[model samples]
Target: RNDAERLADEQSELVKKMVFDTLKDLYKKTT
Candidate 1:
């Protein structure tokens, strides 16, 4: 695979983790 492809996958997962953590924090506040 291309280097860009690998880098993008890493970035995608990092962003996904950040987004999910933020959502969980908001959810906890609502509860």
Candidate 2:
């Protein structure tokens, strides 16, 4: 249970960071 939960948590964190970076990039381009 611990192993599976750990992996899932990391995956979600990575996805959130990626999405945040993408939005920031777009904002920079528009400005």
Best by lDDT: 1
RMSD of 2: 1.7
TM-score per candidate: 0.68, 0.57
* Candidate 1 C-alpha lDDT tens digits along 1-31: 5999999999999999999999999899999
RMSD (Å) of each candidate, 1 decimal: 1.2, 1.7
TM-score of candidate 2 versus the correct structure, residues matched by position = 0.57
In candidate 1, stretches whose alpha carbon ends up further than 4 angstroms from where it belongs are: none
Instruction: Look at candidate 2 and give me any clashing residue pairs.
Output: none
Q: Model 1 has how many clashing residue pairs?
A: 0
Predicted structure with the largest TM-score when compared to the true one: 1
lDDT against true structure, model 1 = 0.95
Backbone steric clashes in candidate 2, count: 0
